[PDB]
Design a protein around this ligand. Structure first.
Ligand code: MET
Length: 241
């Protein structure tokens, strides 16, 4: 019995399809264990409670390894989902008022990612080398902030639920979709597909060469799953296979 941890929302939806493919094509018995946010699946994998997880990109895994020394590696890529900026109050970042309130994720890699997107969009400039080379930028690394934006750093999962009280927020696509935001229609700015944020299936290092691993990855990287991703998420998630 293969226990795969994932985050409730689009990932869990995809995994219902993968579960079916894994059984029919690979003879695997997959159980999908859902988590509400990003915090626990690596710890649960490290401890043996899971056999794999499928919720993160490589910069996130790298950050987690730096923090906890997890012996966890990628077994293969799943999809990429360009992060968007959302607003209930403005149609463009150019419309932000003086002293506008923004919210971004507060974990090292996604906070860095959000600040880079804001930099790309010309809203801010980070201090030299703050967000590159593996370094992660925070709001304290902002060198230029012409509009004197007030940037809150909040838990990634909470961001959709503060939209009424900020002028814009940078929100991970899994959470945006779960909150009925559509990245291809509602976002006022969007990250490029040429980013390092493809998501992945992670397993314990010691298990990386087990036969079930390649079989599981094959089940995910299947025509059925690609078709589901295309149809269900309308281009906000792009298969990485
Ligand atoms: C936990 S790292 C972020 C994962 C999320 N699915 C994203 O691609 O934005």
């Amino acid at each position: 019995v293969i226990k795969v941890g994932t985050v409730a929302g689009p990932d869990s939806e995809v995994w219902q399809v993968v579960q079916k493919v894994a059984k029919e094509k690979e003879g695997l018995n997959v159980k999908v264990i859902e988590f509400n946010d990003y915090v626990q699946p690596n710890a649960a994998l490290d401890s043996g409670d899971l056999d794999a997880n499928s919720f993160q990109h490589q910069p996130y895994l790298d950050s987690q390894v730096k923090q906890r020394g997890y012996k966890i590696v990628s077994a293969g890529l799943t999809y990429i989902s360009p992060i968007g900026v959302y607003s209930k109050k403005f149609k463009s970042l150019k419309d932000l008022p003086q002293g506008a309130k923004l919210a971004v994720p507060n974990d090292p890699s996604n906070e860095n990612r959000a600040l880079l997107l804001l930099q790309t969009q010309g809203v801010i400039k980070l201090k030299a080398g703050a967000g590159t080379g593996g370094n992660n930028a925070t709001v304290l690394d902002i060198a230029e902030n012409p509009k004197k934006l007030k940037i809150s750093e909040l838990d990634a999962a909470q961001l959709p639920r503060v939209l009424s009280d900020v002028d814009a927020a940078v929100i991970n696509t899994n959470y945006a979709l779960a909150a009925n935001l559509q990245p291809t229609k509602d976002a006022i700015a969007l990250e490029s597909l040429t980013s390092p944020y493809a998501n992945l299936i992670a397993v314990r290092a010691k298990d990386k060469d087990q036969p079930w691993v390649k079989k599981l990855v094959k089940a995910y990287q299947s025509p059925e799953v690609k078709e589901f991703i295309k149809k269900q998420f309308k281009g906000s998630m792009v298969a990485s296979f």
